[PDB]
Amino acid sequence: ETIETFLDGLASSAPTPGGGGAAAISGAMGAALVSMVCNLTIGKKKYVEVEADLKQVLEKSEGLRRTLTGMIADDVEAFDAVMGAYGLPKNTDEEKAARAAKIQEALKTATDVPLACCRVCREVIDLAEIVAEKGNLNVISDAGVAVLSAYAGLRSAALNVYVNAKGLDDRAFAEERLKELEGLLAEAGALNERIYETVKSKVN
Amino acid sequence: ETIETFLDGLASSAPTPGGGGAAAISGAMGAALVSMVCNLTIGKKKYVEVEADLKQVLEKSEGLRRTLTGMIADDVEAFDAVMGAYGLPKNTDEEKAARAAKIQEALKTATDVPLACCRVCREVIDLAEIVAEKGNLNVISDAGVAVLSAYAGLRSAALNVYVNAKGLDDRAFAEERLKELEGLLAEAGALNERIYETVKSKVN
């Protein structure tokens, strides 16, 4: 899909793509920029001490980028399934029961997907940190864009987890997913500002 | 250009696409999600007191969307021009003088392009605040994603302002742009957390 077409879809009254899709894109760009800093530090003679560490980082970030790029489509199809299920008919007892059950199972999927996106964005913040410490100083600004895009991705997906978890009958499933989410948010809140500041400082 | 082709380019050792390209996309997705909330609130029986204000928001957000989508290529062009200017030959005295002129010109344009992306992202945050207060409660999460995505874009472009402003001979030019950037950053910092918190609280 074209960036312009995606953006036209996002802006429209089409329920997909939505915030979940944009979240995965924020994450993917974060993963990509970590990979860029690695690719532009590996080889450089001044940066031999970190080359092996950054080849490992590049390995994981390229992994995270593939996953997060896939997650754009996962969130779109997860949220289409939710709208699908709200649109089933509700004339009879049996239909009302089928509809309610299918809504619940779509909601569950549309909670796990943004939550998965949160986990991968949290890992991108960890790699953003390393390339902020070790990266080629000429391109260090890209480590700062990576952490901001990843943190945007994380808190964007988090809102999707909150709004979906609230509609679930299974309170054990919901409360387990919220507790994980809170810990990912609290960790990322502590690191995001510090990594930005390290980059802001090296930039000036 | 496809999201996947952009992401492949972003990750590679090519100096573009870079942090500044990503910043424009972050800003563009922010504007799109403001439009989306407007499109899913306008024509709703329950939201008529606000239908008037939200048609003026749609008009503005659809405008900012168009500008930030164009800024993806503007930022690619501006930074390619910086890299291209450092790589010009120094074989004659006229070449050396032309190269030093073209480096300063490219640094100037590569400071104004990201500063423009910061101004537009700062306006997307004001529009996101309005849709957080007045938008359809069913899609209020997307007002959250819009502000996070716009804030990420503002601060991403800000780092590129800092990186390019540091190479400029013209300190009047650098210091006016830096003074204006500091205003946009201090305002957006204050507003981002409060709009996020409004949306979060209205989610549950």
UniProtKB/Swiss-Prot annotation, chains A, B:
Enzyme category, top tier: hydrolase
GO MF annotations, alphabetized: methenyltetrahydrofolate cyclohydrolase activity
Membrane topology: Single-pass membrane protein
Disruption of the gene: reported phenotype: Mutants are unable to grow on either methanol or ethylamine in the presence of glycolate. Glyoxylate restores growth, but only on C2 compounds.
GO biological process: one-carbon metabolic process
Regions that span the bilayer: 21-42
Biological pathway: One-carbon metabolism; formaldehyde assimilation via serine pathway
Disulfide bonds: none
GO cellular component: membrane
Subcellular compartments: Membrane
Assembly notes: Homodimer.
Family label: Belongs to the cyclodeaminase/cyclohydrolase family.
Protein name as it appears in the record: Methenyltetrahydrofolate cyclohydrolase
Gene: fchA
